[PDB]
Design a binder for this molecule. Structure first.
Ligand SMILES: Nc1ncnc2c1ncn2[C@@H]1O[C@H](COP(=O)(O)O)[C@@H](O)[C@H]1O
Ligand SMILES: Nc1ncnc2c1ncn2[C@@H]1O[C@H](COP(=O)(O)O)[C@@H](O)[C@H]1O
Lengths: 394, 394
């Protein structure tokens, strides 16, 4: 029974999963946190953190490989999948990693300096430790490459796009792609004749319009700062307002970039938490700013769901996914009730059901548009691409 | 026959109109251009520019008053209407100008330093030259004050809103208000039970959602930089992208603010013109970048029209207004065809009709939503507020 090793290298951690090729089931999962710091530890399935002390990306991947060996599945690793943050314009699909690909990843790495260079460090490590294993790169931007110029061009001077490559790229592509495929089965839709809106709500929040199997619009921009308001991210923000704050408080562009990424969003408005479970409980206890943060969060999602619907000839489905989208009974209902204009009617018995019920339809019968919850599986989608590319001569 | 003098003071010009109280008809109109410069001239109805040479706001208003006297209508001026750019949170409706109002205008003037201080200079001048005449302030933001916190709060730290007043204000309020009123008559709608989308396309471009006579969402933000892409303005732009350009080109926040306001938008993408008539002709001659600029322009309008529709319980009408919205047969159709999801069908015979046909319905019969063109009259709306306030004890 061969397996796929899925690796996601962040700036501060390394997340990994081992999926069984036969059933696409998770056999092992873990996180190597506190990366590049003075203290680095490795937890597997939450099985008590084991430290390495001042360890790098290569040493951490070697520790995971040693734990991979302790369970006798090292020689069973047939494929290695790498999650890549930014693929620029060069990558439209998942590819088998070669010297050419690496060079191309380094080319578009300036577009995401924090995340993309960390991905390359993971590629270099896995190459060193598993050279006779086929390795695959899956890009978080590639799905959105089917966008037309009108959908990705910014109203900036053309030169920024042609010379520097300033345009909408969009993220959560792997998730949007996975959820799309599942929606055609759950809603019983013909891919070649369909219009979906996928709402990935969780860590980061993004919307995607999927027309006839292709991504036609997405809420995130060149960076994950554009679009929906998030946990700590501001979302859509007037540049004039940002320029006004820079003059009135005397802050640098770096200072405001810190504020927008880490001090804003749900955390910013409420002044309490970035976690939704905390804010839901706070509002339940009569916290006004927690109510406002959630109400604003809901509003901007509804605004973008209806907004992205314009890039469709016909609206068949709205799919909720991600940590928030799969679990929050409240957020789903408030968003759908905010979208009464589109002729949606919700089934509250179905919307009450917890995530254990998996891929479920939550809209009632008289509804013009089918509303559904589909749990996203980014690890399975990476594995599926890897399995497909595992049958290929390179 | 008493008259209303309407004054709009920009940073570089003074636009004025004299409307007859009885019929709300324009009797005289002119522009004093090149304000505060070494050479300032005054044109009335395009009746050959007459220079004053190095003239200020008070001297220019005195020249208009002298030309007002030459036509024997100085003693006929019953009311003076002032267009004010930014009213902050303090002004929800048009008011009679007193010492209190002036102080309050200066309070919120930091929110629009370029335009708002010029408005005060016009107020000071008209006070000096017409002290026994009732004077009224009409605010370009006041109509959007009915917005709920979820619609105007940014995903920034709460402190920026509470201390500095960073929130969505929105503009074109006078136009959105005027067009709304007219729509209830043209579409035969009950104000208290209606949902409209008003698309003001022209100089600046903004969208407004009008639920039951009240503004519930608007595309422009704290500054007119947010929302739709415009002639020279970028519109919605990823802050992460703007921060990325600042690092890669080594430009100041002031440099990028210049680029976004004057070098971007339709002019930015095409690299040709901010004027739509030029770009329409250019695309007709096979100019690709003029086609892209227009296609992108259309796309962002459709995205925001459908987006703002979420803030409505029911969509009754989409109204096109402004220089572009009233005249561009192409832009109207491309936008409506982009909004096929909402179930709109256009009557192309009606959409062909030039602006001379005034307030006209452009959608066919099977259409789910009525599409119409209503010419905006910001001068008439200012006069109407002034006439109403002219019957009041102060
Ligand atoms: N039962 C729940 N109700 C509401 N929000 C939840 C729940 N479980 C997880 N979340 C949110 O999901 C987010 C995590 O997103 P993700 O990284 O996609 O799992 C966190 O910000 C949580 O606030
Ligand atoms: N016949 C027309 N066709 C297309 N665009 C027009 C036409 N007339 C005026 N415009 C546009 O309207 C804008 C002026 O807007 P406004 O200041 O609202 O009159 C300009 O940018 C013109 O490009």
């Amino acid at each position: 029974f061969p397996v796929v090793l899925v690796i996601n290298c962040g700036s501060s951690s390394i997340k990994f999963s081992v999926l069984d090729v036969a059933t696409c089931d998770v056999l092992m999962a873990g996180i190597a946190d506190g990366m590049n710091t003075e203290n680095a530890f490795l937890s597997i399935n939450g099985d008590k953190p084991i430290n390495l002390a001042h360890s790098n990306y290569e040493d951490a991947l070697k520790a995971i490989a040693f734990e991979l060996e302790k369970r006798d599945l090292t020689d069973s690793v047939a494929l290695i999948g790498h999650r890549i943050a930014h693929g620029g314009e060069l990558f439209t699909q998942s590819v088998i990693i070669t010297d050419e690909i690496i060079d191309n990843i380094r080319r578009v790495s300036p577009l995401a300096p924090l995340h993309n260079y960390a991905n390359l460090s993971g590629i270099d490590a896995a190459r060193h430790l598993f050279p006779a294993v086929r390795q695959v790169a899956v890009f978080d931007t590639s799905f959105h490459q089917t966008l037309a110029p009108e959908a990705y061009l910014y109203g900036l001077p053309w030169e920024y796009f042609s010379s520097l490559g300033v345009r909408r790229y969009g993220f959560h592509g792997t998730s949007h792609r996975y959820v799309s495929r599942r929606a055609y089965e759950l809603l019983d839709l013909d891919e070649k004749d369909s219009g979906l809106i996928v709402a990935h709500l969780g860590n980061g929040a993004s919307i995607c319009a999927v027309r006839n199997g292709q991504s036609v619009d997405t809420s995130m921009g060149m960076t994950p700062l554009e679009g929906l308001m998030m946990g700590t991210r501001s979302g859509d923000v007037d540049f004039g307002a940002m320029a006004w704050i820079a003059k009135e408080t005397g802050q640098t562009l770096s200072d405001l970039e810190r504020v927008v990424n880490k001090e804003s969003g749900l955390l910013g408005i409420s002044g309490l938490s970035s976690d939704l479970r905390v804010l839901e409980k706070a509002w339940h206890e009569g916290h006004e700013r927690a109510r406002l943060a959630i109400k604003t969060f809901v509003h901007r999602i509804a605004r973008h769901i209806a907004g992205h619907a314009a890039s469709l000839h016909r609206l068949d489905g709205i799919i909720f996914t991600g940590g928030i989208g799969e679990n929050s009974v409240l957020i789903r209902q408030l968003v759908i009730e905010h979208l009464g204009v589109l002729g949606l009617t919700l089934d509250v018995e179905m919307n009450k059901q917890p995530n254990s019920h998996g891929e479920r339809i939550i809209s009632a019968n008289p509804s013009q548009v089918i509303c559904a919850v589909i749990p996203t599986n980014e690890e399975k989608m990476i594995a599926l691409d890897a399995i497909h590319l595992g049958n290929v001569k390179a």
